[PDB]
A paper describes a structure:
Bacillus NrnA was crystallized in the P21 space group with four molecules per asymmetric unit. The B. subtilis NrnA structure comprises two globular domains connected by a linker region (residues 178–194) that consists of a short α-helix bordered by two loops. The N-terminal DHH catalytic domain adopts a mixed α/β fold featuring a 5-stranded parallel β-sheet at its core. Residues from the DHH motifs come together to form a surface-exposed active site that faces the C-terminal substrate-binding domain. The C-terminal DHHA1 domain of NrnA also adopts an α/β fold with a central mixed β-sheet and helices on both the apical and basal sides. The four NrnA molecules in the P21 asymmetric unit of our crystal structures display variation in the orientation of the C-terminal DHHA1 domain with respect to the DHH domain, and the distances between Cα of H284 (at the end of the GGGH motif) and Cα of H104 (in the DHH active site) can vary from 11.9 to 19.3 Å. NrnA from B. fragilis, M. smegmatis and M. tuberculosis are reported to be dimeric, and Bacillis NrnA in our crystals packs in a similar manner. The dimer interface in Bacillus NrnA covers about 1600 Å2, 11% of the total surface area of the molecule, and is centered around helices α5 and α9. Whether dimerization is a consequence of crystal packing or is the physiologically active entity is unclear. In either case, the NrnA active site directly faces the DHHA1 domain of the same monomer and away from the dimerization interface, indicating the catalytic cycle of an individual nanoRNA occurs within one monomer.
Author numbering: -3 to -1, 1 to 275, 278 to 311
Amino acid sequence: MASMKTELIRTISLYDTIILHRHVRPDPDAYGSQCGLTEILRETYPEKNIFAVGTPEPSLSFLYSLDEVDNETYEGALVIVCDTANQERIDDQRYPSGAKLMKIDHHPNEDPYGDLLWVDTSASSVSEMIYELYLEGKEHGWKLNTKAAELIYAGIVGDTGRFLFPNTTEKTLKYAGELIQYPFSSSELFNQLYETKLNVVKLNGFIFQNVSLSENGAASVFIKKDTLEKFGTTASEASQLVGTLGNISGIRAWVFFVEEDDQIRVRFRSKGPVINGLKYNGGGHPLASGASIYSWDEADRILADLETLCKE
């Protein structure tokens, strides 16, 4: 809604202090929406006290640095939470202690928190929504500088896997075209987003070398303790590699089994068949899913089922 968009801008003009949140374990969209908006507000309102809080992610610290804020700073503040569907995942829970709370998200509105809410499930990403907000804010004095343009672009390219994912729409590409006119270097941004440690690259090599495809295009990857120790890779590094099998000729759906301290992180992926239906105490989207498990026996039966989902 255009009105709804205007009501956010009006509210932002009104508060002297604005403190911005995002979700725990932030991804590029969280940096681009939260920090992109911070940077628009800093440029536009050099008289306001603007702060972006939370715990940084070291692989994205190159985008922007966060602030360490006192409890007193929230008194009478506007608080803005970006890209966070559930209150319990907001990084830095002090979010409701301001005078006002504003929710800007693209995930379904199951937790309809905020005094003002702007939820658009058709946006690719919350970074796209921030660029659309800025388009409506321009007429009200908003300024997008080079740093902000770079943040928003980074959000959009990280969240869509660089216009690869089904969440890419016409607006995504249009706004990216607009944003790429700012004098930041897109190629050094991509170099940094995609920079990968040699040991993780090696683990990725081990996975490619040993993957096998059934008759039905099903595939599986067991990354056990020993494997992690040998490559010096964390379980989280290993699981983040699940998406690298997607270009294999004839692959339909696959799964990673990563052995953690407490559980075994399971990651599912599919080139077509729906895999949320595969129940095992965890679900997700139709082509990307997750769950936990507690023995290899249980993994072995997930396998039998994957075979079936792929045969059918």
